[PDB]
UniProtKB/Swiss-Prot annotation:
RNA-directed RNA polymerase that catalyzes the transcription of viral mRNAs, their capping and polyadenylation. The template is composed of the viral RNA tightly encapsidated by the nucleoprotein (N). The viral polymerase binds to the genomic RNA at the 3' leader promoter, and transcribes subsequently all viral mRNAs with a decreasing efficiency. The first gene is the most transcribed, and the last the least transcribed. The viral phosphoprotein acts as a processivity factor. Capping is concomitant with initiation of mRNA transcription. GO terms for molecular function: ATP binding; hydrolase activity; mRNA 5'-cap (guanine-N7-)-methyltransferase activity; RNA-directed RNA polymerase activity. Residues 614-798 form the RdRp catalytic domain. This is RNA-directed RNA polymerase L. It comes from Mumps virus genotype A (strain Jeryl-Lynn) (MuV). It comes from the Viruses. The gene is L. The chain holds residues 4 to 1415 of 2261 of the full protein. Belongs to the paramyxovirus L protein family. It catalyses: RNA(n) + a ribonucleoside 5'-triphosphate = RNA(n+1) + diphosphate; a 5'-end (5'-triphosphoguanosine)-adenylyl-adenylyl-cytidylyl-adenosine in mRNA + 2 S-adenosyl-L-methionine = a 5'-end (N(7)-methyl 5'-triphosphoguanosine)-(2'-O-methyladenylyl)-adenylyl-cytidylyl-adenosine in mRNA + 2 S-adenosyl-L-homocysteine + H(+); a 5'-end (5'-triphosphoguanosine)-adenylyl-adenylyl-cytidylyl-adenosine in mRNA + S-adenosyl-L-methionine = a 5'-end (5'-triphosphoguanosine)-(2'-O-methyladenylyl)-adenylyl-cytidylyl-adenosine in mRNA + S-adenosyl-L-homocysteine + H(+); a 5'-end triphospho-adenylyl-adenylyl-cytidylyl-adenosine in mRNA + GDP + H(+) = a 5'-end (5'-triphosphoguanosine)-adenylyl-adenylyl-cytidylyl-adenosine in mRNA + diphosphate. Interacts with the P protein; this interaction forms the polymerase complex. Interacts with host RUVBL1 and RUVBL2 (R2TP complex); this interaction regulates the viral transcription.
Amino acid sequence: LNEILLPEVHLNSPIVRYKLFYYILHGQLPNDLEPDDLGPLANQNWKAIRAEESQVHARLKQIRVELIARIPSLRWTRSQREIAILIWPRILPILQAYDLRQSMQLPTVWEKLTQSTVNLISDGLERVVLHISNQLTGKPNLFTRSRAYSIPSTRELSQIWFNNEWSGSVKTWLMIKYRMRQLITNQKTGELTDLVTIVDTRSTLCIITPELVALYSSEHKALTYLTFEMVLMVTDMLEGRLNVSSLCTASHYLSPLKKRIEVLLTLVDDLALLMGDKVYGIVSSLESFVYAQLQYGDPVIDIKGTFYGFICNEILDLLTEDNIFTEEEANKVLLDLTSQFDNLSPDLTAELLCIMRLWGHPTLTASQAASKVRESMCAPKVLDFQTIMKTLAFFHAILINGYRRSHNGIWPPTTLHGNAPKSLIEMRHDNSELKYEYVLKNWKSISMLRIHKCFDASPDEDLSIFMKDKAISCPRQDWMGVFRRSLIKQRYRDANRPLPQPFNRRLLLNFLEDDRFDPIKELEYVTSGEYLRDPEFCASYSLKEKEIKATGRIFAKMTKRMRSCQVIAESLLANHAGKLMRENGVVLDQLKLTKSLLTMNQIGIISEHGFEIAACFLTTDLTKYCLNWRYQVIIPFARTLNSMYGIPHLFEWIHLRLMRSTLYVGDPFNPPSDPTQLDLDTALNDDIFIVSPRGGIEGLCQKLWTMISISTIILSATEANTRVMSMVQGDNQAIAITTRVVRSLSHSEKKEQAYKASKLFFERLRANNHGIGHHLKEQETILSSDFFIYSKRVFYKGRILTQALKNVSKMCLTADILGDCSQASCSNLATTVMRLTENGVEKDLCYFLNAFMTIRQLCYDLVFPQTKSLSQDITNAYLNHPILISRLCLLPSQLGGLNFLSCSRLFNRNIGDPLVSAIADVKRLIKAGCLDIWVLYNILGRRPGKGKWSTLAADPYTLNIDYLVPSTTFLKKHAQYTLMERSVNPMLRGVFSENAAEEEEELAQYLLDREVVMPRVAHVILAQSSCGRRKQIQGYLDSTRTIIRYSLEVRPLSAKKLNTVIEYNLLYLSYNLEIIEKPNIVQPFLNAINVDTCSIDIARSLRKLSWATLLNGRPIEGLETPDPIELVHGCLIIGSDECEHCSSGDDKFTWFFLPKGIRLDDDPASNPPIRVPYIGSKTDVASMAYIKGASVSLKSALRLAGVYIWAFGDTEESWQDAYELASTRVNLTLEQLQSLTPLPTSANLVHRKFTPASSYAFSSFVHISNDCQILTDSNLIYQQVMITGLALIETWNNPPINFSVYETTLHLHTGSSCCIRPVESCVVNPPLLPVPLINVPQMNKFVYDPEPLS
Ligand SMILES: [Zn+2]
Ligand SMILES: [Zn+2]
């Protein structure tokens, strides 16, 4: 079992300083730590602690005596020796000193294997991309126009990735991490022998232990100790540095950033050595300085350089805070730090926000983390009553207006106070729109307005909320169980009290193993006030991982009942009250969100092609808002929400419970300093305790706070008589103040006028925020006439800045997920490469990088085996033949390979048929020479796998090939099944059944075993049926690492299952060895397929032979979709050129036009008019009866019936067959089912954070016209063609290029192509099989509704 629950490969936990201190002091390791540094650990009785844990102490003593023997000088005390013991933050400038190059062969073998494999496919990939450019533009310089400098191929990429700086460091820390993970795994199994590893490299001695490593560098005479989390963090940071430096070296776009990033890294490493853990304040100041430098180019003189100067002052304060540097040294350091950000384009100035994670993370202490929140929270705060009531009145107005525009424009049930004026009387009587200008006046009457019950909201409305695992704290009596037993044993022995019981329960497991669960009775915990009277309640903080800022270093955890009430209340707020606010543009659809943000940023840019429209953008972060929320400023809003929802007392729970409870920071190695503090309630407001908190907690009750902030923003906007559009995000907000200026004014003067108009709004907003208790400092406020910040992305002058280096920094050598398969890692690398394509990096370079890192990952997995195997035949066969490695890496993942990035994926996110794209890629590789035609013949002639009807129906477009599903998803499904099997919750009484797989197989066979097989129709019908609903509910579980471990423990895997999960990688490699080794003998009729055959025909034939066992010769219809690159034969027209396809026969094309004279980040009058580009089209029914408030079951049944009738026929027998599959989810009869069913024609057949598809730099000025074309598959095809054309236009002028001196026209002639085929459907398809006996959860509300109509 321990071979699956391997130690994590990447950092996921905070670095605890006291853990390392505990390990160092346990074995009496040499150190120069002051008594103040040790904190509470100095007064611990280490004799007893060493008496226990004797294996740990024995290992530590062994490494100590090895250190003494190797370095005799370490015995000297009082720091009179020449060797200095350094803790993690002070070893940054000496990371390159640790080499271990000798007595280390695995990294060298890995590098040699990667080079040998890459050397075989570089030219083929160059030919592939050349052919792609020739086919998509008609010219061979599509990808090389912006660079022509130097074109990096795959071999060049490998050379500059393995030969640059940090490469040796990455190899030596990868070996160290691998050895330490091996030692940890051995220790878990109880081997107890040879658990100390010594490498003893010349000038660098490293000793590896399952607990910590001891690294000594002779060149610098510095010895350091690193725990496992520290080692993971160091190797992750080194890998990120390697990726960033190599990408800067490779891409011409990021070339200027290389030297600046290197100089910044060196400067901050020296600063870290000189300072300690206080250099991460400087790192955060640099994070803010990126935006300060962005604001330095603002046209307005009054707003240019303010943030720059403030951030410089903050950096100087941080530098001179502890008197490490004098004024002149701090000034020189500041100048050196700032000189790396000057003379950079706005895109690059935002791609220096990648270096935040490049210096690791600070060593956290519970006391320091608690100090910040205790300073912010638990503080007196004076609040303005008038501001509170004005905000409440505008809250009422916004809620009323949001209830209007829906519900037939009818006012909610409201009660008017006695001093409402006649105008309010008539407006309530009339039910007209409450004008904000009207609400500003008579605010005393708009307030004191009781809004009665509006929604019949039910806590159990959403089921997915209850299925998400959340951390839950121990009761108030076991609050000391979080700390290590060794540290608290002496305290509990002195006090003569029993040791606290460790707490390991989870919220998800408590919910699932709850016999009597009901949200109606669960909310009574808060409604009846039992939470205030609960003595067991205990809320505690815990250190947050991968956090460098002082704020947000802790996240809180609460008891099971309180957490359940919190999630129920948040869901209640978001479902009904949250939807009423449309003043902010937040939507659950990302496409609409980015369109709204693009329009908001493009408000200010108006071209010459009266009074124009001008915008000034204001962005403020709300991270510190949670600690500053007070009960008095939220009581009226929450009271009105209570009245609206009908629950007498549901909200205001966080503050009321917090003022009566004592909070603490729970860290296993950070016990309270005072050994006499054995109880939480009587603790003092110091150390790790936060006595009587009066503020909020981050994330908790975020919806109410966001609505209050929206009301405040609206109030401020109306107070200054300025038009704004808010976009509050919870942790951030962006405001665009709108004003009307003269058209003839110069752009600088229009911006000045906009800023002058926005000054009053900003003053009113600051005054209102101060009134409600949120003081706005210069840190929070960034005023810019060009850009605003949303979702950590900068919207600069109608674009979105790239930040591709931030994406490339997290491209590591192994997925942190459980299975750790080669396929999962390759998929992660491909996803990161897709992000790089979207974020401005060269598409050709991204393709080469994806191939190179796929090869590198496979070589790493081959030469760094996670689990030792008795038979190494497969591993040796792959290691000795790099051509096999190349063939496997270049083969698409749909055919069994590890190439998860298709050629067409480089241009459009949406892919119709993955198999067609895979076939097109294989044909391209065969034409270039990367692969061989006999590989394609072997794939065509491959023996069908062990597939059933269920796998064909559940996941269409997939061939019958074994080992296409990684062991990771198998582990996730096993965890979900184990959770379902032991579940006893009433809400899931009938979800789980033992014959679920049999029922799914029978239904899939019924839907598929017909005259014509329709995998999409079967997939949709299965998903919308009862069994599909049960599968969805079972898949609602999160299946985290803890959940997977619990499932493996309570339900152990069989020996055969254990072995196959362990050796999935070797089994997959051996399975693909049958096709990537030698030309197999295939059937003679397969020779008809050639490299010139259309990918659609090849895909149809491959699906026919692959599923030959299941179908016995029947063809598969409804899946094929043209490959976007192969479908279109584009031509680019520059100046006097003409389209060859237009002049020769073809007359179908998608017209793309780019005007001339465009210059980004320049005068808006000069360039052609700007507009929101085409980012995509989502779902957008004419049913006989428009049922309002229809349940999910009713909609699912209606869609199932419609799809069945549309696909299998409109005969009465088909209607009876679909009646059963509809009645498995509703209680309709045939007549109501037929009447209520939507129109059964043109079935969509569609079924299954902020990542924009592009920067939209040059796609905003483009002109499109699809008039000369035919025009829901055709709509998807045309949308894909449009997106591909936009991507082609964008890559024609890469982010290195910012001007277009000539007008360009793109045609993308989709005609005269073999992939265009007529679409035929709606034929008669008799069932051919009796309808299976389906068990339906009649009593379950979330699957079946006995009353689907009112
Ligand atoms: Zn043309
Ligand atoms: Zn074709």
